[PDB]
Design a protein around this ligand. Structure first.
Ligand code: CLA
Ligand code: CLA
Ligand code: CLA
Ligand code: CLA
Ligand code: CLA
Ligand code: CLA
Ligand code: CLA
Ligand code: CLA
Ligand code: CLA
Ligand SMILES: CC1=C(C/C=C(\C)CCC[C@H](C)CCC[C@H](C)CCCC(C)C)C(=O)c2ccccc2C1=O
Lengths: 140, 740, 47, 150, 144
């Protein structure tokens, strides 16, 4: 018994190696459950949900606050700016795999699986901008 | 707790004064360099850079305490003198409105007599904004004789402190054991100083209030004012002015406290006669604070065995995220004279700011709210004082990790964690600063773009309704309904800045329900931006002062060092004292924006005039309902319209505030000489002048050298602040006199 | 009156437990409990 | 002299250099009963009468003729004795004073000699301690209505 | 407790005790013929408030403050060391000091004979002598 087990194991058994607010022991498992870095899957699916999450809310800001927000046409300004930025952002994200070229044997996190998740990101972003598009139409 | 005195340690001799630099053998044998001339004064107050014997360091700082204390007493004893020899306080005592304040006269030498401002009362001079007349009126002082007696009584107390700081030293000297009695120290500071101080002044404004309250507020001449001793020598006079004095400390023992309700009340708000807070509420206030401090002054171990102690109090506080928490903090504060100074400078610095806010919010002195120059000056005065003090708190909280922190002696796992996950603290504050910057000032860029672009500012009006009157509006409404409901014993709010539509006017507006709007959310977040950046850089200098990732051997170099060299791409300005040097600058920007906000928003919506045909007409009538949202309005309607009151004064008596205004930019831009150039070029610049000095041998024995790398930056911030305060000092004292 | 003096006396005698047995501290704190309850009583004001 | 287990200390000072009040507390009471005998002594212009004495007939005018020096000198008299009590021994005491600790040693005195004493010494402050209960025992009634003779 | 500080303290006591005695023997001497006699009409014209701000005496006080300066600028160095200034009064006093010591056995320390008592009596008595006659207009309470 040296120092009586590290002053109470640094208070009631902390541990938590990959936890300190980066992702709790529940949240790190929630990240493994989270599709952006999902286990047991490859081509398209690691992405796809990425776009279905990003493009889904990209309609949000420019509908109420964008440079166009005072007439009836303004329901479209939230989507045109979003889709234009979606094309720009898709190019910017796809270019990362072109910059990387060291792990050509590790095709998942480098080039192959990288493009095989951004491919789902393109349809996810555009489609997700179209998914939240038809959600506020029946109430208007 | 024991009388341990080391009588006679240092003799009384002029021998040390004969040697320039006796405090250090390194600053005595080699005065062959110009740099030594500046090192003699730079280290003159760095007492921990001489001897390490704490029994002598404690016997060199308590000496400086009594020395500074004597300087302050010499300073205060003159204020009562200037308000008697040449002033207008008695005439202002009879006529307070038409007679402007003044307590400084000039002489006919070079035509400077134009500064004699026509204030009235048969005396000309220079207007004052120190609040001396309000304090003296709130003290019951009427005759000039009461000024001279207080001044002559101040000379005695000023001399006794010099003969005290020269007593416990060249004559006496307590041991080192007398300083670890921090337990016995807080029992005499919270009870002897705070306690008896809040009680002694409380017992004064109970018997001196009626020469101000039940006399000077009725309409009696200053000659008809009775004497303060005539009220005490005859208890029935106090009994008639207050029908509670007939008892004379009889229900005080009977616990029939309600019979003392003629002086002890809790009204709230302001008085519609004087112009400030109630003269009876402050007496009861200080009585309430005095008893609380008489209780709070008994908390630590003396020599009877009862009570807590800073030791086991901190040895008991734990916490999950803290680990070995709070323990060792006793050894932190009881060993380093420095260590107490940062927590003092931090608390007292924020205290000066908080009391500055409490000044304008609820004016405690009579005839203070209407006196706009004094009010505006005093707020920003304590504002900048606390700015310097909090940065000094960072300046020394950076000293601690370098000068008095050890990995074996003093230990708190809390402070350990502040240095173990140290890269996380500043990372959080960094992202917070950037989020509060790219938006608060980003929205400034946004709105200034919307106006020059066209119809975008028009569609911003709905967003101008947002944020503003959305938050903090309900807080004011809570305070509107706080009396009666959550304050049954209060017939008024905390201040009339809370009570809506309730305006108190004494020919000039005293307070207003400060209706937030338009851009208060903007400037408050400019504040929070400049506050988080200031806290970031200073806290960075605090916890990165010991362990640094770039250079691991950081403790060897020091605190006020230049850098390391051109290696590692470039190690430049990495000292914690430089985080304070730049910390002074972000504090400078913070306090500058806060004084701008306070000052201008006042006359925008608060300060104004009143007529019977209408209601309220401000000096500048509701301008920052739009001119605050953009950066342009801060120099289109703010920094531009102010030149009509600072420059258009040469034909009057306000010409000095224009000369100091235009001359403060000189010394500020003079700081741009040191904050931009380097010692290398300037050192190549001397040797040419020294060549001309070697041509005629007129070269001094003291070899001409450039300023130190650190001393140049210390002088640079000195001028950036002096030249960066005297301009707004001349500006705050420019318009407020013309529009007073 | 007598009820108030005995009120202070009972407020100082209700302070005689284990944590109060230390002489002068039990008396001073007694007034804190005594006068305080009286100030809480205050000729029965309450609400 | 009857007690058992409880904690409680009669007299005693932790630093035990408290002679400023303790030494004079039986002497301060000597000038207290002086007021009990009081200023009237028989015939001539009597100084004061009845229970009122102290403050009802305290003279209408009294900040000077009630001597400031009279109060001042008390402090001055105290300074001779009371100030000089931490240590502050003076050279005047004694003959052949050099090396005073060596000459005529004192010591504890519990041994054989000086048996059965200091009872007398301790006797006075017993009355002083008696007095504090007894003094204020008459003082509580002074606040009240004080009908007639009281 | 220290040497050089108590030096100026005991000196200032001596340097003013003679001043606090020649002034008493000067203020009493100038008012010996007008002490009583109907209380000199409340000090008569000797009341300081009645004086015309010392019109004729101001230029005289300046001359006095000048000469008195060098008088004390002789007292400052004459105290320094024993020789010259203090040494000649030194052996002068030693002539009565020898007889006084003979009357007082081994030495009879003269400072205990009356250097401190006279020095402090003059100061305290002159401090009270300046308040009873010059620092009270309305008595209110009878002064005894
Ligand atoms: C985009 C802003 C932002 C960023 C970049 C960070 C980044 C960081 N934080 Mg932080 N945090 C933030 C906002 C942010 N935080 C806010 C708004 C709060 C509440 C005031 C916190 C409260 C917080 C705590 C208490 C701690 C951190 C810690 C950390 C560091 C550990 C890694 C991590 O937590 O991953 C990112 C975190 C998330 C993506 C959120 C996790 C999901 C939550 C539980 C929902 C890291 C550098 C830890 C540290 O100090 O490092 C040792 C730590 O203890 N953060
Ligand atoms: C730090 C306190 C302070 C300050 C800033 C001043 C400032 C001033 N005094 Mg003053 N004075 C003071 C304390 C002070 N005094 C005290 C304690 C007394 C004794 C009660 C006097 C008695 C006094 C008299 C009798 C007179 C002045 C006068 C003056 C003015 C002329 C400047 C001068 O000659 O002095 C020098 C100024 C400085 C050396 C710079 C300020 C010093 C700080 C510490 C730096 C000036 C504005 C004269 C005047 O105004 O004419 C009517 C005048 O006649 N003063
Ligand atoms: C043009 C040159 C000039 C000259 C020769 C003087 C001379 C004088 N001034 Mg003045 N002054 C000047 C310019 C000048 N001033 C200007 C431009 C301003 C406007 C900013 C002032 C504002 C001013 C004020 C407010 C006062 C004086 C006062 C004085 C007198 C005493 C000052 C002192 O104690 O020592 C001189 C001080 C210095 C030389 C500065 C060196 C030390 C400082 C504190 C650092 C003195 C005769 C005081 C006075 O009138 O006495 C009653 C006083 O109250 N001056
Ligand atoms: C050398 C010139 C000089 C001197 C000696 C003084 C001296 C004084 N001024 Mg003053 N003042 C001056 C120039 C001067 N002033 C000028 C040119 C202006 C612009 C017109 C003012 C405007 C001004 C105002 C508005 C007020 C004073 C006040 C005061 C008094 C407050 C004490 C103080 O501020 O300490 C010195 C302060 C320092 C920061 C100096 C210390 C720092 C180092 C030594 C530099 C003091 C006696 C106040 C007062 O009530 O008057 C009685 C007051 O309210 N002054
Ligand atoms: C709860 C503490 C407290 C508070 C709220 C106040 C509040 C006030 N004080 Mg006060 N004071 C205090 C403690 C406090 N005091 C103590 C402990 C002392 C003894 C040193 C004094 C001695 C004092 C004097 C001599 C005077 C005041 C005066 C005043 C009034 C105007 C000054 C001011 O605004 O600064 C307020 C200061 C603070 C807010 C800091 C206190 C915070 C503590 C640490 C908590 C004001 C309403 C002035 C007055 O009577 O008005 C006419 C006045 O002349 N105070
Ligand atoms: C108008 C000039 C100017 C501008 C626009 C900035 C802008 C900025 N400064 Mg800077 N600064 C300036 C002058 C300026 N500074 C000067 C003159 C100094 C010398 C004293 C400093 C010293 C300084 C330090 C030491 C730090 C900054 C930091 C920052 C950044 C804070 C993060 C943020 O809120 O982003 C918002 C973007 C906009 C408002 C645009 C920010 C981009 C801090 C930083 O890097 O981030 C934490 C930082 O630590 N500044
Ligand atoms: C019970 C007696 C009592 C009385 C009569 C007062 C009276 C006053 N206080 Mg005060 N105060 C008290 C107790 C009291 N206080 C206590 C116990 C504390 C905590 C230690 C404070 C802390 C305090 C602060 C911090 C401030 C005042 C202030 C004030 C003045 C503002 C007027 C007002 O709004 O009313 C009462 C003021 C309140 C803030 C509400 C009651 C106090 C607490 C918060 C409830 C006023 C004259 C202000 C001031 O100093 O003026 C410049 C100020 O800022 N007081
Ligand atoms: C030797 C070259 C030189 C000279 C002579 C000046 C001269 C001046 N500069 Mg300048 N400056 C220089 C180089 C120079 N500068 C350089 C290289 C830079 C960097 C590019 C600057 C940047 C700079 C800035 C940013 C500012 C100045 C300002 C000023 C003026 C200050 C006004 C003043 O108080 O005067 C004397 C007037 C008085 C009334 C004297 C006051 C008397 C008191 C009361 C005593 C002044 C005339 C300031 C200005 O006025 O803006 C135009 C200003 O803000 N300069
Ligand atoms: C060469 C032109 C010039 C220059 C370089 C400056 C420079 C400056 N001015 Mg100035 N000003 C100018 C012209 C100029 N001004 C003119 C023509 C006027 C009208 C007469 C003003 C009126 C003015 C006022 C009223 C103030 C300044 C202030 C300032 C300082 C801002 C302090 C700061 O950066 O903190 C941060 C500031 C912001 C983030 C905003 C700064 C050094 C302020 C100051 O000096 O404070 C001491 C201030 O109060 N100026
Ligand atoms: C000018 C300058 C210097 C040189 C600074 C000097 C030489 C300071 C000069 C100040 C003194 C006080 C001026 C000389 C006056 C003498 C003291 C003589 C005075 C005698 C009577 C007037 C009292 C630097 O060392 C430096 C270093 C790093 C960046 C920039 C700079 C920089 O700009």
């Amino acid at each position: 018994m040296t120092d009586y087990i590290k002053p109470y194991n640094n208070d009631p058994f902390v541990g938590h190696l990959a936890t300190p607010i980066n992702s709790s022991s529940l949240t790190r498992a929630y990240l493994s459950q989270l599709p952006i870095y999902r286990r047991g899957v490859s081509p398209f699916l690691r992405g796809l949900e990425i776009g279905m999450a990003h493009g889904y809310f990209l309609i949000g800001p420019f509908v109420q606050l964008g440079p166009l927000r005072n007439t009836d046409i303004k329901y479209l300004a939230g989507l045109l700016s979003a889709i234009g930025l979606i094309v720009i952002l898709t190019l910017g994200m796809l270019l990362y795999g072109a910059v990387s070229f060291t792990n050509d044997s590790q095709d998942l996190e480098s080039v192959d699986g990288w493009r095989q998740l951004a491919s789902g990101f393109l349809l996810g972003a555009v489609g997700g901008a179209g998914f939240a598009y038809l959600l506020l139409t029946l109430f208007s | 707790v024991k009388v341990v005195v080391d009588r006679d340690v240092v003799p009384t001799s002029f021998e040390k004064w004969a040697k320039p630099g006796h405090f250090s053998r390194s600053l005595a044998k080699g005065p062959k360099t110009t740099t030594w001339i500046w090192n003699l004064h730079a280290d003159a107050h760095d007492f921990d850079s001489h001897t390490s014997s704490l029994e002598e360091v404690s016997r060199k700082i308590f000496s400086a305490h009594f020395g500074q204390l004597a300087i302050i007493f010499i300073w205060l004893s003159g204020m009562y003198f200037h308000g008697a020899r040449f002033s207008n306080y008695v005439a202002w005592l009879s006529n307070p409105t038409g007679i402007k304040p003044s307590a400084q006269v000039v002489w006919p030498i070079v035509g400077q007599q134009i500064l004699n401002a026509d204030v009235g009362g048969g005396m000309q001079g220079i207007q004052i904004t120190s609040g001396l007349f309000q304090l003296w009126r709130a003290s019951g002082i009427v005759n000039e004789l009461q000024l001279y007696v207080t001044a002559l009584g101040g000379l005695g107390m000023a001399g006794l402190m010099i003969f005290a700081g020269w007593f416990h030293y060249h004559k006496a000297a307590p041991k080192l054991e007398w300083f670890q009695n921090v337990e016995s120290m807080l029992n005499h500071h919270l009870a002897g100083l705070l306690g008896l101080g809040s009680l002694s002044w409380a017992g004064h404004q109970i018997h001196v209030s009626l020469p101000i309250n039940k006399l000077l507020d009725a309409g009696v001449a200053p000659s008809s004012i009775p004497l303060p001793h005539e009220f005490i020598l005859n208890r029935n006079l106090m009994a008639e002015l207050y029908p509670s004095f007939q008892q004379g400390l009889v229900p005080f023992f009977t616990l029939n406290w309600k019979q003392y309700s003629d002086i002890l009340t809790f009204k709230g708000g302001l008085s519609p006669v004087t112009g400030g807070l109630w003269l009876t509420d402050v007496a009861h206030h200080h009585l309430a604070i005095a008893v609380l401090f008489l209780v709070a002054g008994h908390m630590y171990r003396t020599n009877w065995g009862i009570g807590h102690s800073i030791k086991q109090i901190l040895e008991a506080h734990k916490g999950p995220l803290t680990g070995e928490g709070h323990k060792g903090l006793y050894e932190i504060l009881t060993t380093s004279w420095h260590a107490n100074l940062a927590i003092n400078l931090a608390m007292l610095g924020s205290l000066s700011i908080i009391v500055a806010h409490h000044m304008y919010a609820m004016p405690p002195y009579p005839y203070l709210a209407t006196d706009y120059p004094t009010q505006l000056s005093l707020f920003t005065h304590h504002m900048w004082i606390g700015g310097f003090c909090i940065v000094g708190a960072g300046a020394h909280a950076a000293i601690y990790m370098v000068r008095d922190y050890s990995p074996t002696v003093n230990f708190n796992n809390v402070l350990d964690r502040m240095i173990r996950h140290r890269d996380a603290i500043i990372s959080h504050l960094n992202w917070v600063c950037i989020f509060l910057g790219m938006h608060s000032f980003g929205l400034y860029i946004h709105n200034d773009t919307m106006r020059a672009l066209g119809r975008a500012q028009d569609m911003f009006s709905d967003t101008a309704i947002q944020l503003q009157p959305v938050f903090a509006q309900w807080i004011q409404q809570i305070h509107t309904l706080a009396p009666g409901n959550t304050a049954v014993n209060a017939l008024a709010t905390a201040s009339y800045a809370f009570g809506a539509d309730t305006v108190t006017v004494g020919s000039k507006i005293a307070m207003m329900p400060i209706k937030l709007g338009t851009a208060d959310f903007m400037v408050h977040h400019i504040h929070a931006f400049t506050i988080h950046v200031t806290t970031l850089i200073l806290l960075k200098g605090v916890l990165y002062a010991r362990n640094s990732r770039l250079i691991p051997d950081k403790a060897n170099l020091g605190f006020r060092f230049p850098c390391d060299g051109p290696g590692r791409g470039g190690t430049c300005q990495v000292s914690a004292w430089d985080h304070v040097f730049l910390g002074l600058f972000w504090m400078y920007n913070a306090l500058s924006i806060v004084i701008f906000h306070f000052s201008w928003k006042m006359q925008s919506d608060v300060w104004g005039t009143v007529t019977s045909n209408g209601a309220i007409s401000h000096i500048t009538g509701g301008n920052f309902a739009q001119s605050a949202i953009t950066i342009n309005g801060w120099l289109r309607d703010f920094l531009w319209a102010q030149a009509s009151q600072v420059i258009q004064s040469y034909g009057s008596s306000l010409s000095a505030y224009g000369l100091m205004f235009l001359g403060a930019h000189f010394v500020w831009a003079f700081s741009l000489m040191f904050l931009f150039s380097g010692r290398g070029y300037w050192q190549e610049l001397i040797e040419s002048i020294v060549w001309a000095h070697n041509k005629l041998k007129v070269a001094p024995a003291i070899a001409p050298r450039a300023l130190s790398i650190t001393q140049g930056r210390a002088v640079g911030v000195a001028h950036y602040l002096l030249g960066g305060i005297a301009t707004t000092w001349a500006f705050f004292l420019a318009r407020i006199i013309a529009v007073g | 009156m007598i009820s108030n003096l005995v009120g202070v006396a009972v407020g100082r005698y209700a302070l005689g437990r284990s944590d109060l047995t230390q002489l002068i501290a039990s008396m001073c704190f007694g007034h804190i409990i005594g006068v305080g309850i009286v100030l809480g009583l205050s000729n029965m004001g309450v609400i | 002299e009857g007690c058992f287990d409880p904690l409680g200390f009669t007299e005693v000072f932790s630093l035990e250099w408290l002679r400023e009040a303790e030494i004079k507390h039986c002497r301060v009471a000597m000038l207290a009963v002086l007021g009990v005998i009081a200023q009237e002594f028989g015939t001539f212009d009597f100084y004061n009468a009845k229970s009122k004495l102290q403050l009802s007939p305290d003279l209408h005018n009294q900040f000077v003729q009630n001597g400031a020096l009279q109060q001042i000198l008390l402090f001055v008299c105290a300074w001779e004795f009371i100030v000089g009590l931490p240590a502050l021994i003076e050279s005047v005491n004694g003959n052949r004073e050099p090396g005073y600790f060596g000459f005529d040693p004192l010591k504890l005195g519990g041994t054989v000699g000086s048996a059965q004493w200091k009872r007398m010494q301790a006797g006075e402050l017993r009355n002083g301690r008696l007095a504090m209960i007894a003094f204020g025992g008459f003082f509580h009634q002074q606040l009240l209505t004080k009908q007639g003779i009281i």
